[PDB]
Structure 1
Amino acid sequence: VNIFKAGADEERAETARLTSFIGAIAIGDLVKSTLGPKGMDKILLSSGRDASLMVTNDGATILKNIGVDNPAAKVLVDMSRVQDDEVGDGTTSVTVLAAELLREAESLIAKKIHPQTIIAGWREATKAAREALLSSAVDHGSDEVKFRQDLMNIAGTTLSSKLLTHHKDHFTKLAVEAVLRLKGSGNLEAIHIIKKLGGSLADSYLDEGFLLDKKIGVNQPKRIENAKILIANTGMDTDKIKIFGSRVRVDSTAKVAEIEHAEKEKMKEKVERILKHGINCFINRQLIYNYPEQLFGAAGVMAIEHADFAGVERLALVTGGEIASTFDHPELVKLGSCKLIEEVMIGEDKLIHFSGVALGEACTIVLRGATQQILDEAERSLHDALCVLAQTVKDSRTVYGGGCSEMLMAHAVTQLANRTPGKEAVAMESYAKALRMLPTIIADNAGYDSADLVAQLRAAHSEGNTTAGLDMREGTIGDMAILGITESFQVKRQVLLSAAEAAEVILRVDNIIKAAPR
């Protein structure tokens, strides 16, 4: 007898894990074609309204854009998005590793092994692998030149799997420089990425100051030397007295004429109070109406209308001023400083160029490609590189990439498995196989002999050479210490832990109950 609903169903057997495994493997196979320096990106086309088209390489936006149906696919997409939020890298890596973990899981359950046995084996294996990765982590930060070289290597390895690889030598350092302007503040919003079409992608440059996409007023000057910027968050509009319930109730036209004259005079006195600070520039958050603009033009200052919260925050960071709202006491927290406020033209548009800024705490990156999709992909991948660089500035521990860290931690898992009895050992062996399946995939997407390369790496790591990985520009087994394929320790640790946790949570379901759709 059926009891649920019309449209509600239950899969309480091998069918449930069949659906979960096939969905996770579909996610893994879709994401798999975008790993390594030789990975190839994808086109996302919307069948709905506006037919949005986006060319992308990373797995986070690929998985979040598509509409997944299988709940396991939803689990993988959520894990990828969470991992992108946490660090900003390895979303494709974590999704692929989870997919291979589930594949080895179904292979094991074919051999009639209880899922909790696999769970215990995986817990022990991930503990050992995390311990080995932590033991193999190299650290810097005390050094200055060595840490800068490490940052350059991290940017290179993060940016080599994307389109900017075509000009990687130009871009990596640029990204590093941007992070070097943050001065340790974990504020990625201090970085502005302005994307304008036209010209090769090698024309992109990190500005030596700031760029604002706003407009000068009518009568204000359009160039200043030795700027004294005051940044404000005042009204400058009609500017109601804010006492709700106030109205003019008079008996003549002279009275209302006098009241409007008083309103204009109070606005004039507010502008005079602003000018008393000793300024030649003024940046406001919301609109500036016609009378304050006229007064500013007459006085001889420069005013900016409608610079949003992000704009004023970035100007405050790059110039050093405070966000003013009340100008009663000009002697309190002071202004900012620059050296030129020239208007500079890019493409066909004009932007305000703050040069000679007092502080480098914020900056702008100009992205200029030949196609809007190229601009979007460059922006997303540059965001990933900046995220990783900021994360490794916060925590300078690094581990070698190219599969070397994966190979060594898989070797540790294998060594632990060899000394553990029972059916746990095969679970840990499957864990190690799934973990080693990543460099296999990188070589496959590259197009080399994956089996030979992986066997060579296994032999080299078992011997003791703990810095061996895939040299992809030639396709052999090289030394990541000499070559310089580094990676953030935080990124790899988060990838491992998140993938293992998602595999564990998915594997222990034996019943899927779907309610009737709305």
Structure 2
Amino acid sequence: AAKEVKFHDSARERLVAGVNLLANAVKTTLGPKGRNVVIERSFGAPIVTKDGVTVAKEIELKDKFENMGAQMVKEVASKTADVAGDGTTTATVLAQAIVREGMKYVAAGMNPMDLKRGIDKAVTAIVEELKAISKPCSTTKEIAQVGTISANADSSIGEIIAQAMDKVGKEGVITVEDGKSLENELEVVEGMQFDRGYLSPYFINNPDKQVAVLDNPYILLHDKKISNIRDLLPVLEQVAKAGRPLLIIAEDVEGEALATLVVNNLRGILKTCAVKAPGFGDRRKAMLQDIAILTGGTVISEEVGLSLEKATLEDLGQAKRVEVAKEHTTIIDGAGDPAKIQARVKEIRVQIEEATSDYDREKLQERVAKLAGGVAVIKVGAATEVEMKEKKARVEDALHATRAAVEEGIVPGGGVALLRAREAAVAKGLKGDNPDQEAGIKIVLRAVEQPLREIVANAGEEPSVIVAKVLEGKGNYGYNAATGEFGDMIEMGVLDPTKVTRSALQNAASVAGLMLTTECMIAEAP
């Protein structure tokens, strides 16, 4: 169709309008005293929320050229969120601040590329300083404290998180399942997680968690491509007559087969989910074999003398539960006997010494870890189903925060962390090779205080005086919007994982650079 093209300021200002309109809605839900945002529902009463994730997801504008910036900032915010579990509100606010300051200098005739380079230099310096301000958290007591703080002073959640992490590994897999009692419980079951997601968003069945969950399904293993629906019809018919859900692991599924699976999932004909097999090259067969032996199934392949047209339910693997997310899929309580699993673990461990390179050895070690480590399952316990729903979400959020916290430590939250990092970086000595790079540095130095300013503004106080008072303090000293007091932010349990702040700042800087160095904009004509 016909396109409409906008150049220079006439397009940068539309980007700015879009990002400003997205951020003005998102930032009202930032801080302990964040305001409410009312969102229309198609039917029934409007939904009111005070979290940035839901408000941002619903925001998309009428004008296409503003929607461009809105969606790019939303995408970078979601990229920040999915890897840290929080900060998408912070990332959008930081991006708005950086862009709003950057357009002032761009309109001043200053070089956009040098502005981008100065912004990158300042962000690199601030991130490098965050690695020093951050307090590490590796002791079980520290892990429990961080979990309790993230779970709103619920000590049981923190204790359960610590007990799951300290025996399965800080890099281990932890999942949450509804418990059978009032007290939370945990267990280790045979399972693994691999970095493969569902191939279509229609596969999801839990919009609240944005994941696909199947209960006691069959596992289909294939090492070749699947495009023809006929190639798996006799197997899916057996699965449907069996009545249990289906998880299909293949090299790829596309075309009429994928379309038919999507239609079946939408119509409720059969509960199906298809993901790409993990790894590539020769690692593909090893991954498929390990998954099959873990789920008790057999890989369907010509080299092993089986065909999908004749495959039966006996060849298929099975497990208690499989969770399919956007980036990774995990298997819970595979049907494989522990004896064969341990034998294969020993086989892989002795093949480790057969590695021809450090890359081979590290992949074999990853295989050993993903196979022998199992999956930690947290049985969240509470009195009622209504309390079940809330406690499960709280435990999941605490688990994500602890996973982020244990990797990079904790840092004074509420936006004080960025101020401390900025002051430390400036004291270290930060300069640009050009006056344009100097303005780029100034842009980030002014923008990194925006999260605290907006938290204070939503709290109702005057931003400038609070920011000045926070800057006059040193260390963990900061402002607590929940109570309005000044003191050690860590001591009151107001924390953010260093990963969250670092990722928010870096993604905001990236999107700000992209929409500062943008000179042309192409969109569909009205």
User: CA contact under 8 A between 1:83 and 1:91: conserved in structure 2?
Assistant: yes
1:9 is aligned to: 4
Closer, same or farther: CA 130–156 of 1 in aligned 2, 3 Å? same
Structure 1 residue 501 corresponds to structure 2 residue 514 = no
Closer, same or farther: CA 157–90 of 1 in aligned 2, 3 Å? farther
Deviation at 1:447?
2.2
User: CA contact under 8 A between 1:137 and 1:398: conserved in structure 2?
Assistant: yes
Deviations 1:165-188 (A, max 9, x none): 4x7566555555554564435324
Deviation at 1:98?
0.9
Structure 1 residue 184 corresponds to structure 2 residue 170 = yes
Unaligned residue ranges in structure 2 (runs of 5+)? 190-215, 221-231, 235-294, 298-317, 325-329, 343-373
1:60 is aligned to: 53
Specify which of 142, 145, 167 is matched with residue 150 of structure 1: 142
Deviation at 1:18?
0.8
| Secondary structure class of the residue paired with 1:364 | strand
User: CA contact under 8 A between 1:193 and 1:366: conserved in structure 2?
Assistant: no
User: CA contact under 8 A between 2:30 and 2:89: conserved in structure 1?
Assistant: yes
- 1:206-245 matches, within 5 Å, as 206-207=184-185
2:376 is aligned to: 361
Deviation at 1:503?
1.0
Closer, same or farther: CA 368–121 of 1 in aligned 2, 3 Å? farther
Closer, same or farther: CA 27–155 of 1 in aligned 2, 3 Å? farther
Letter in 1 for 2:172: G
Q: Distance in 2 between matches of 1:57 and 1:182?
A: 35
1:134 is aligned to: 131
Structure 1 residue 490 corresponds to structure 2 residue 493 = no
User: CA contact under 8 A between 2:137 and 2:405: conserved in structure 1?
Assistant: no
Q: Distance in 2 between matches of 1:331 and 1:452?
A: 66
1:31 is aligned to: 26
Q: Distance in 1 between matches of 2:83 and 2:459?
A: 28
User: CA contact under 8 A between 2:22 and 2:59: conserved in structure 1?
Assistant: no
Closer, same or farther: CA 511–445 of 1 in aligned 2, 3 Å? same
Deviation at 1:361?
2.9
1:276 is aligned to: none
1:116 is aligned to: 113
Unaligned residue ranges in structure 1 (runs of 5+)? 142-146, 160-164, 197-202, 212-230, 236-241, 245-282, 286-304, 317-321, 325-329, 335-358
Deviates more, 1:30-39 or 1:383-392: 383-392
Deviation at 1:439?
0.8
Letter in 1 for 2:333: L
Q: Distance in 1 between matches of 2:179 and 2:523?
A: 44
User: CA contact under 8 A between 2:476 and 2:489: conserved in structure 1?
Assistant: yes
- 1:239-318 matches, within 5 Å, as 307-309=320-322, 313-315=331-333
User: CA contact under 8 A between 1:35 and 1:445: conserved in structure 2?
Assistant: yes
Closer, same or farther: CA 487–19 of 1 in aligned 2, 3 Å? same
Deviation at 1:421?
6.3
Letter in 2 for 1:450: P
Per the normalisation by structure 1, the TM-score is: 0.60
Deviations 1:260-302 (A, max 9, x none): xxxxxxxxxxxxxxxxxxxxxxx999xxxxxxxxxxxxxxxxx
1:87 is aligned to: 84
Closer, same or farther: CA 314–484 of 1 in aligned 2, 3 Å? same
Closer, same or farther: CA 467–310 of 1 in aligned 2, 3 Å? closer
Letter in 2 for 1:131: E
Closer, same or farther: CA 378–137 of 1 in aligned 2, 3 Å? same
Deviation at 1:133?
1.3
Structure 1 residue 470 corresponds to structure 2 residue 479 = yes
Q: Distance in 1 between matches of 2:393 and 2:75?
A: 19
1:387 is aligned to: 400
- 1:69-88 matches, within 5 Å, as 69=64, 70-88=67-85
Letter in 2 for 1:365: V
Letter in 1 for 2:396: H
Structure 1 residue 434 corresponds to structure 2 residue 447 = yes
Structure 1 residue 450 corresponds to structure 2 residue 463 = yes
User: CA contact under 8 A between 1:87 and 1:388: conserved in structure 2?
Assistant: yes
Specify which of 17, 25, 28 is matched with residue 22 of structure 1: 17
Structure 1 residue 411 corresponds to structure 2 residue 423 = yes
Letter in 2 for 1:384: D
User: CA contact under 8 A between 1:232 and 1:284: conserved in structure 2?
Assistant: no
User: CA contact under 8 A between 1:154 and 1:487: conserved in structure 2?
Assistant: no
Deviations 1:402-430 (A, max 9, x none): 33321112224545457876243333223
Q: Distance in 2 between matches of 1:307 and 1:34?
A: 38
Q: Distance in 2 between matches of 1:476 and 1:14?
A: 43
Deviation at 1:381?
5.1
Letter in 2 for 1:402: G
User: CA contact under 8 A between 2:178 and 2:388: conserved in structure 1?
Assistant: no
Deviations 1:8-47 (A, max 9, x none): 2111131201110111111211111222222245454443
User: CA contact under 8 A between 1:414 and 1:429: conserved in structure 2?
Assistant: no
Closer, same or farther: CA 84–381 of 1 in aligned 2, 3 Å? farther
Deviations 1:206-251 (A, max 9, x none): 235699xxxxxxxxxxxxxxxxxxx99799xxxxxx9x9xxxxxxx
| Secondary structure class of the residue paired with 1:323 | coil
Deviation at 1:89?
1.7
User: CA contact under 8 A between 2:149 and 2:494: conserved in structure 1?
Assistant: yes
Q: Distance in 2 between matches of 1:487 and 1:431?
A: 20
Closer, same or farther: CA 333–377 of 1 in aligned 2, 3 Å? closer
Q: Percent identity?
A: 21
Q: Distance in 1 between matches of 2:60 and 2:497?
A: 31
Deviations 1:458-482 (A, max 9, x none): 222xxxx222211334313212354
Q: Distance in 2 between matches of 1:505 and 1:52?
A: 39
Letter in 2 for 1:134: K
Deviation at 1:53?
6.9
Deviation at 1:78?
1.0
The structure whose Rg is larger is: 1
How many residue pairs get aligned? The number is: 368
Per the normalisation by structure 2, the TM-score is: 0.59
User: CA contact under 8 A between 2:26 and 2:52: conserved in structure 1?
Assistant: yes
Q: Distance in 2 between matches of 1:433 and 1:34?
A: 21
Q: Distance in 2 between matches of 1:448 and 1:28?
A: 20
User: CA contact under 8 A between 2:456 and 2:462: conserved in structure 1?
Assistant: yes
